[PDB]
Design an enzyme around this catalytic site. Structure first.
Site, short mmCIF file in Angstrom:
data_model
loop_
_atom_site.label_atom_id
_atom_site.label_comp_id
_atom_site.label_asym_id
_atom_site.label_seq_id
_atom_site.Cartn_x
_atom_site.Cartn_y
_atom_site.Cartn_z
N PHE A 138 -45.00 -48.97 -93.45
CA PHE A 138 -44.32 -49.92 -94.33
C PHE A 138 -45.33 -50.68 -95.16
O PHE A 138 -46.45 -50.97 -94.72
CB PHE A 138 -43.43 -50.89 -93.53
N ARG A 164 -35.68 -48.76 -95.83
CA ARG A 164 -35.46 -50.13 -95.38
C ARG A 164 -36.15 -51.09 -96.34
O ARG A 164 -37.33 -50.91 -96.65
CB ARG A 164 -35.97 -50.35 -93.95
N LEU A 169 -45.74 -60.50 -87.44
CA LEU A 169 -46.18 -59.14 -87.16
C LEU A 169 -47.64 -59.06 -86.74
O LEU A 169 -48.16 -57.94 -86.58
CB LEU A 169 -45.96 -58.26 -88.40
N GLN A 219 -40.06 -50.33 -96.09
CA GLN A 219 -40.47 -49.28 -95.17
C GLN A 219 -40.34 -47.91 -95.83
O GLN A 219 -39.43 -47.66 -96.62
CB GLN A 219 -39.63 -49.34 -93.90
N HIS A 241 -48.97 -54.53 -85.29
CA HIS A 241 -48.98 -53.35 -86.13
C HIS A 241 -50.40 -53.10 -86.62
O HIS A 241 -51.24 -54.00 -86.66
CB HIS A 241 -48.01 -53.50 -87.31
N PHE A 289 -40.28 -59.70 -97.17
CA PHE A 289 -40.92 -59.44 -95.89
C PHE A 289 -41.53 -58.04 -95.80
O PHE A 289 -42.75 -57.93 -95.64
CB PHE A 289 -39.91 -59.68 -94.75
N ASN A 299 -44.02 -49.87 -85.97
CA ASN A 299 -44.10 -49.73 -84.53
C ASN A 299 -42.84 -50.29 -83.88
O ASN A 299 -42.15 -51.15 -84.44
CB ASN A 299 -45.35 -50.44 -83.98
#
Ligand SMILES: [Mg+2]
Ligand SMILES: [Zn+2]
Ligand SMILES: [Zn+2]
Ligand SMILES: [Zn+2]
Ligand SMILES: [Zn+2]
Lengths: 138, 175, 56, 170
Positions: B113, B55, B122, B63, B126, B60, B102
RNA sequence: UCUGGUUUCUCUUCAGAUCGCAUAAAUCUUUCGCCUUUUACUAAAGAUUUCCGUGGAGAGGAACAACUCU
RNA sequence: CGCCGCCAAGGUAU
């Protein structure tokens, strides 16, 4: 961790070190979480409960079991793993199933009395699941 | 000076080699014991070999930590996923940070990530457990290409070829 | 020592387990500073001793 | 690719900024206070000498001035957003005080800092298919037989009643 | 042989001792020095308080109170 | 024998 006594303490500390370390870890886990769901004071109940069970563990470790010595008992009182005035209240005859020290303070209650937590259930009314707002339950 | 790095000091460092280059991840083992423990254990098991980055959201997140490549395969060495471990000094105000991925509640495993920018959505969601030493952050800034074909999963994702452990505290074993 | 828009370090999960490094702690030798060797570096010098001090 | 050094030491200093040096100006051994100290010292040593003409430098022919910055300090900075602008000269063109007003006499109505801060954060007649779409004098694309029936209806156009004058083309 | 008590925690008024081997601010009434008006001021005297602490005394407990001063 | 170290209300109306 903070030891604040420079002692290198004697026997037997190596057999209570992982147990009290796990109790300290669970006390950090009971201190860390936010207060969502827990209303105003029931997030403050389990830290009182875990200090009660830690003081009770040292209590029946020294007084009941007679395994640990008096020097390391006073060491655990002086460091912070146990209390000094609470065990003097547990030493008294009429009660040793006490919750914590917030039910004995008669001027903490504005009506000049003790809490309902320090009441025998057999003389209290039959079905009520009442819990102390200062201490947590009974 | 007035730069004010605004972070606790680190303890423990590992090396991670991808086709994009070398990344030296240094961890906060004191401020996050269980997540760093799982990370050094899965690095010592050579678990992240052939693990691709599935990902990429440019600017941003990027992952990794999925051996299956679908976004749901995560297996900790605990048997069950572990808790969230937050810190007020460890927030998402910059890039180069590493955090366990998460999906709501306390569900953290091998799925993590890297950050690519300001990630204020976030915060308190996390577990930040490490950063990347600079002069090597561009080996993971090469991971953010617009070749994605979708919201995630580009054509040729980069894979981790090896994971060395430079410093190893709280000694562990591979099973 | 710390920038603005920063909380004051949140002493619950930062240095609760961190030990301090070292104080000044001048090394006193025995046979010249022998009566004061056991208590010269103590926040209470003599407290639990009715021979020298009054009490608590 | 950027290869690493393969070391266990972290990215920077151990104190994490506790020894900021603030070396923006001239450093310690080259500062003008140090030059004045050297000049004062060498004027204190050479006293029995009377014009030995080794001459010692420029200022030595016979702590003020550029003062040393505190190396252990950042200056506490504040953003002074508030301008001093003659509003009655800016938006109107006549200040009542004239040249006696303490403010700026500015007329540039450009954006401030905070405005940049809170701006940066965000056929058709019969409605059938084109059966031979063909044109008129005035661009009107019609059909063949439909526009023939339209001319049988009226000798002018349909959109703006233009005089077709018998002129119908593809 | 009888006589038989140091600490700690709570009220109780008196203080005239460098109450404290040291020493803060404010108010008033005056003299000044910067000063435009004032609060921020300057620094000397006179007299009041406020405030951080302290001294001896009446009780109720508890802390080894039974070691033992007598 | 070596003074002195400065804030604000006073203006861009309600
Ligand atoms: Mg006026
Ligand atoms: Zn109780
Ligand atoms: Zn309780
Ligand atoms: Zn109660
Ligand atoms: Zn003006």
């Amino acid at each position: 961790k903070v030891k604040r006594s420079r002692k290198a303490p004697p026997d037997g500390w190596e057999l209570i070190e992982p147990t009290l370390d796990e109790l300290d870890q669970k006390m950090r886990e009971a201190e860390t979480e936010p207060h969502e769901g827990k209303r105003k004071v029931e997030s403050l109940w389990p830290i009182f409960r875990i200090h009660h069970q830690k003081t009770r563990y040292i209590f029946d470790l020294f007084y009941k079991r007679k395994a640990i010595s008096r020097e390391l008992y006073e060491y655990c009182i002086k460091e912070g793993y146990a209390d000094k005035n609470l065990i003097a209240k547990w030493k008294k005859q009429g009660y040793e199933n006490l919750c914590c020290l917030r039910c004995i303070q008669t001027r903490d209650t504005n009506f000049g009395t003790n809490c309902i937590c320090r009441v025998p259930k057999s003389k209290l009314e039959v079905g009520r699941i009442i819990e102390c707002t200062h201490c947590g339950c009974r | 000076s007035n730069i004010y790095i605004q972070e606790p000091p680190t303890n423990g460092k590992v090396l991670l080699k991808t086709t994009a280059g070398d990344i030296d991840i240094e961890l906060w083992s004191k401020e996050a014991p269980k997540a760093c423990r799982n990370f050094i254990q899965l690095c010592l098991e050579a678990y992240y070999d052939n693990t691709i980055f599935h990902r990429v959201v440019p600017g941003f997140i990027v992952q990794g930590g999925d051996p299956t490549g679908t976004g749901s395969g995560g297996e900790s060495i605990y048997g069950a996923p572990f808790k969230d471990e937050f810190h007020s000094r460890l927030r998402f105000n910059r890039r180069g940070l590493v955090a366990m991925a998460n999906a709501g509640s306390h569900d953290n495993g091998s799925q993590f990530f890297f950050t690519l920018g300001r990630a204020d959505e976030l915060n308190n969601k996390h577990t930040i457990f490490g950063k990347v030493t600079g002069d090597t952050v561009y080996n993971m800034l090469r991971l953010s290409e617009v070749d994605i074909d979708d919201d995630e999963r580009p054509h040729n994702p980069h894979k981790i070829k090896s994971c060395e452990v430079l410093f190893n505290p709280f000694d562990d074993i591979i099973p | 020592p710390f920038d603005d828009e920063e909380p004051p370090l949140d002493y619950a999960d930062n240095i609760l387990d961190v030990e301090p490094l070292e104080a000044i702690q001048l090394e006193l030798d025995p046979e010249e500073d022998a009566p004061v060797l056991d208590w010269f570096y103590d926040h209470q010098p003599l407290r639990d001793s009715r021979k020298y001090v009054n009490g608590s | 690719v950027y290869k690493s050094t393969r070391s266990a030491k972290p990215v920077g200093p151990e104190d994490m900024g506790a020894t900021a040096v603030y070396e923006l100006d001239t450093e310690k051994e080259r500062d003008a206070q140090a030059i004045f100290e050297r000049s004062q010292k060498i004027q204190e040593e050479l006293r029995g000498k009377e014009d030995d003409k080794i001459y010692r430098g420029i200022n030595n022919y016979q702590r003020k001035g550029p003062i040393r910055a505190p190396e252990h300090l950042r200056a506490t900075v504040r953003w002074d957003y508030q301008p001093d602008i003659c509003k009655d000269y800016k938006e109107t063109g006549f200040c009542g005080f004239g040249d006696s007003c303490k403010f700026l006499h500015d007329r540039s109505d450009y954006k401030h800092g905070w405005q940049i801060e809170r701006e940066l954060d965000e056929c058709f007649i019969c409605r059938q298919s084109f059966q031979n779409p063909v044109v008129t004098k005035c661009r009107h694309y019609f059909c063949e037989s439909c526009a023939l029936q339209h001319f049988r209806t009226t000798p002018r156009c349909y959109v703006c009643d233009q005089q077709t004058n018998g002129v119908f083309n593809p």
